[PDB]
């Protein structure tokens with residue numbers, strides 16, 4: 001039994017593991033990590049927690065009756081343990097059956113999810129690689145993060161923008177006078193990376209602070225970002241940012257402050273937006289006063305913020321919560337319009353950036369090569385959050401970015417690396433729609449709500465039980481890490497690659513799936529390709545064994561630290577045009593105009609959302625800020641020792657303002673029921689003035705624990721906030737999710753005592 005230390009990586013960062021007698025006993029942060037995440041101790045625990053999945057299992061009803069099984073009991077925990085050969089045979093037959101009876105349109109393989117980093121052990125790509133050899137599948141398009149903004153940005157600035165490099169942090173420290181964080185909490189969200197994180201935002205934030213730059217935070221909650229800087233804190237009613245923006249815009253026009261030359265030379269359509277802004281088209285001048293009526297931010301503050309932004313070198317750094325909402329396309333389009341008026345786009349330290357809060361955006365990029373991994377070998381496509389509408393309406397038409405298509409008639413869904421029974425909106429509607437699927441197959445290493453609702457569950461390994469390779473730094477490209485195997489696979493878990501190879505072998509496509517390569521065979525070909533490309537560029541890299549032995553290769557920064565977004569566009573717009581039809585920033589879009597969608601007009605517009613705090617005729621009184629957890633990565637690590645540090649009487653915490661608690665007779669630590677017309681959950685309250693009055697904070701990612709899966713509307717005992725959200729599209733343009741457009745009521749829970757069952761394994765899988 002192994003004794004020693006191994007260096008690996010994860011979504012939380014690079015770390016070294018201490019191994020004693022074959023068991024991992026500690027995870028220590030990399031010595032070069034400038035700001036490790038306290039969640040690493042849950043990462044270690046997730047390998048061994050009580051919800052680790054030990055063996056392959058098949059739902060008793062599915063085993064007994066297949067397609068005639070009662071599908072309303074999915075999630076009741078009545079599983080049967082089976083051997084691997086039996087489950088592999090059954091998965092293979094099911095894939096074959098659905099592909100022959102129904103075609104590629106009967107298999108949903110979008111399998112949305114955060115999985116784990118790794119260029120070889122890429123479970124979602126491997127799933128698509130297997131399914132492509134089986135005949136095809138329906139896929140997902142977009143994501144739950146920027147569903148609206150990633151569609152609107154290309155119409156407005158000609159590129160995706162949300163996942164592109166930002167003006168380097170050092171440039172901001174030298175040049176920015178006012179830094180605005182709009183619906184962004186960089187301190188909280190920069191702990192993680194899509195590939196391994198370098199945590200580059202922390203030194204970037206430290207440098208602004210050290211320089212005395214003025215920092216403003218626009219957020220309903222007083223976050224760690226406000227506290228870190230002692231920032232001026234503006235607290236709007238959630239979903240009213242566009243109103244605020246329009247009032248600022250109005251003020252710049254009324255007081256004649258805006259940059260008319262920038263407007264004239266770098267933008268298109270302002271002259272079509274001005275009438276709206278001034279109130280000629282609807283009789284409603286969008287003044288600061290008007291904006292105060294909707295958002296509750298004082299008129300005078302709105303004009304003061306406007307005047308300050310125009311006279312100082314200002315960076316508008318915006319988060320994505322505000323577009324994860326009804327009409328969410330308007331938030332970033334109005335933000336770019338406002339930035340246009342200020343006219344600082346393309347100057348060092350000015351303009352706007354849409355990725356300073358995620359994966360190190362702004363961290364100076366190196367000049368190293370890109371690393372690539374296994375590939376998938378490749379309506380057939382749906383916007384990802386329309387999964388439930390698809391299941392309910394096979395054959396119906398839907399709009400998406402100017403086109404019309406029809407929903408495929410899906411009969412099977414195969415999910416790996418994701419938790420839709422946590423991440424998707426309107427849990428009760430979803431639980432009923434899932435009955436439309438004949439077979440539901442899932443691989444995970446933790447017994448999440450999704451695993452609990454499968455017909456067939458296959459235990460996967462973590463990254464700590466195998467070898468892989470991955471880049472460090474989604475934007476920085478700081479280096480390449482060897483993700484070395486720390487302990488052996490636990491119980492009967494197997495890597496996703498191994499399971500898929502065995503299924504492909506049973507479909508008679510084994511060789512095509514593996515390409516005749518084993519684990520190290522694949523990893524070395526990704527490395528050799530990256531070294532070959534590096535040599536071409538003049539970056540020297542060791543040979544593979546030398547690399548593997550050191551465990552990491554770092555790259556040099558040459559001019560990456562001088563990067564300024566949009567500089568060449570500002571420098572000469574004709575020579576360096578945007579990808580838009582006019583080549584300019586499009587305030588009014590003729591392209592959007594021609595689609596003629598009522599919920600997405602051709603210029604940024606204030607529109608009432610489905611439900612909003614203090615909106616006319618609103619039924620519920622509190623906005624739920626259903627934002628990202630501080631101490632989880634979505635649902636990951638919920639079933640670990642970290643839960644004990646935030647849970648209130650065992651439930652997911654609910655933050656509530658002293659006055660809202662006082663009005664309902666609630667005291668700190670009480671168990672309360674949060675409910676609206678879509679569902680009802682239990683949470684434990686923390687009374688704090690960190691949330692503005694009218695707002696409550698329930699993070700997304702809580703593990704759904706239904707009291708009874710056969711009872712429609714059954715009470716969730718843990719606190720999955722997606723039990724209360726609605727499942728609707730941002731608009732016909734993007735069809736994004738509206739996960740944070742949520743109102744509810746809260747009362748002291750006075751029903752029967754409840755026993756939590758989500759943090760232990762189903763009895764048969766013990």
Ligand SMILES: NC1=NC(=O)C2=N[C@H]3C(S)=C(S)[C@@H](COP(=O)(O)OP(=O)(O)OC[C@H]4O[C@@H](n5cnc6c(=O)[nH]c(N)nc65)[C@H](O)[C@@H]4O)O[C@H]3NC2=N1
Pocket residue numbers: 112113114115116121123144145146324416417418419420422423424443444445446448460461462463496626627628633634635636700701721722725739740
């Ligand atoms: N109401 C609401 N508000 C929101 O802000 C919100 N945010 C959304 C966002 S932006 C997104 S990205 C989604 C994220 O939702 P997503 O389903 O991506 O969530 P995770 O909790 O990261 O689930 C990933 C699963 O993969 C499993 N897993 C990890 N590694 C492996 C592996 O190698 N193999 C296998 N088989 N499994 C693995 C993990 O154990 C975990 O259960 O939530 C969305 N949902 C949201 N809802």
Ligand SMILES: NC1=NC(=O)C2=N[C@H]3C(S)=C(S)[C@@H](COP(=O)(O)OP(=O)(O)OC[C@H]4O[C@@H](n5cnc6c(=O)[nH]c(N)nc65)[C@H](O)[C@@H]4O)O[C@H]3NC2=N1
Pocket residue numbers: 144145146182183184185188189190191192218219220221223236237238239240241319320321322324357358625626627628629630631632633634740
């Ligand atoms: N620790 C951590 N856990 C995670 O799960 C996690 N998820 C990652 C993922 S996949 C992504 S996509 C990003 C998400 O990055 P994103 O910016 O979408 O994060 P949120 O936590 O949903 O919201 C950020 C802030 O917006 C505020 N806010 C909410 N509604 C409004 C509003 O109407 N107006 C204004 N002005 N502010 C509002 C919230 O209070 C919150 O502080 O984070 C990434 N980083 C993450 N870090």
